[PDB]
Design a protein around this ligand. Structure first.
Ligand code: 6KD
Length: 295
């Protein structure tokens, strides 16, 4: 795909917003447009920079970040600016947190899977993201449109498939595991394996033994099936991302109002930690209503 060579004199850096998977993201202006620039900081992030630049350029999809171009002095990428911030920040970040609905949660997960499905259909070899998690998912258009960023692989223990941290023969089915966890996360508004915590290896061990995050009380069985399939030990028993996009598209019939921008605040307090099952943040009342009207 097309790319622009950037003169750094054409960039006016406004403020530093935070760090990506590598480097530093800064809000900027270029060609009088609102951009986000990602500067390398460690010089050891050179491999990551080359990988992201290599992938983002050939990738072209509504649910993957627009790469506008690159500047080589100093070494930085010029991408689109995400107004809403990361999905992680929307779920768990700074108070006051925005209120969101089951429709949003389902819509976000559909959009995410849409991007990943595109990546998995790349020619001649599939493109695996290898790092799917809410900090690498961005929200634009008032939090109604999701974009995948941070392709530096193409603190992640909670979203990683068991075969990945085992160094084993992993395929694109590891992305499917990640998506499974993300689905659980947006439904519950809980950090996966927050209960476990510790350092990384404590989660890795838990997941490796077959620990998955707790089941959700009152969750629809078709969503529950999809979720628990996505996080099977055997990679072959997980669905394809092509199948996930189709299933999720069809469930959106029972999730209307997904295009309503995040605007209402939320004062969020959490139920007891481990009961076996957890309460969803979102309400499935309307789902069940619209379902029984059809079925
Ligand atoms: C992850 C973070 C930087 O994400 C935000 C962004 N990010 C972007 O616009 C962005 C555009 S491209 C791109 C990328 O490739 N990686 C990470 N972020 C981006 C913007 C505003 C707030 C946030 C946001 O959650 N922080 C709020 C403030 N906190 C100190 C840091 C997190």
């Amino acid at each position: 795909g097309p790319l622009h060579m950037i003169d750094y004199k054409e960039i006016e850096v406004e403020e530093v917003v935070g760090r990506g998977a590598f480097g530093v993201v800064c809000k900027a202006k270029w060609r009088a447009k609102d951009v986000a620039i990602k500067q390398i900081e460690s010089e050891s992030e050179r491999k990551a920079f080359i990988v992201e630049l290599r992938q983002l350029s050939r990738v072209n999809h509504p649910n993957i970040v627009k790469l506008y171009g690159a500047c080589l002095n100093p070494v930085c990428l010029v991408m689109e600016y995400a107004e809403g911030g990361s999905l992680y920040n929307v779920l768990h970040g700074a108070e006051p947190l925005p209120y969101y609905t089951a429709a949003h949660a389902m819509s976000w997960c559909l959009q995410c899977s849409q991007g990943v499905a595109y990546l998995h259909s790349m020619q001649p070899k599939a493109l695996i993201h290898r790092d799917l998690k809410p900090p690498n998912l961005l929200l634009v258009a008032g939090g109604t449109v999701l974009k995948i960023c941070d392709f530096g692989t193409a603190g992640s223990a909670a979203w990683m498939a068991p075969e990945v941290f085992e160094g084993s023969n992993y395929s694109e089915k590891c992305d499917v595991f990640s998506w499974g966890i993300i689905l659980w996360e947006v439904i519950t508004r809980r950090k996966p394996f927050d209960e476990i915590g510790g350092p990384a290896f404590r989660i890795m061990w838990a997941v490796h033994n077959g620990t998955r995050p707790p089941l959700i009380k009152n969750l629809p069985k078709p969503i529950e099936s999809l979720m628990t399939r996505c996080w099977s030990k055997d990679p072959s028993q997980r669905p394809s991302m092509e199948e996930i996009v189709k299933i999720m598209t069809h469930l959106m019939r029972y999730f209307p109002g997904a295009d309503e921008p995040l605007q209402y605040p939320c004062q969020h307090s959490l139920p007891p930690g481990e009961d076996g099952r957890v309460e969803p943040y979102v309400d499935f009342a309307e789902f069940y209503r619209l379902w029984s009207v059809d079925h």
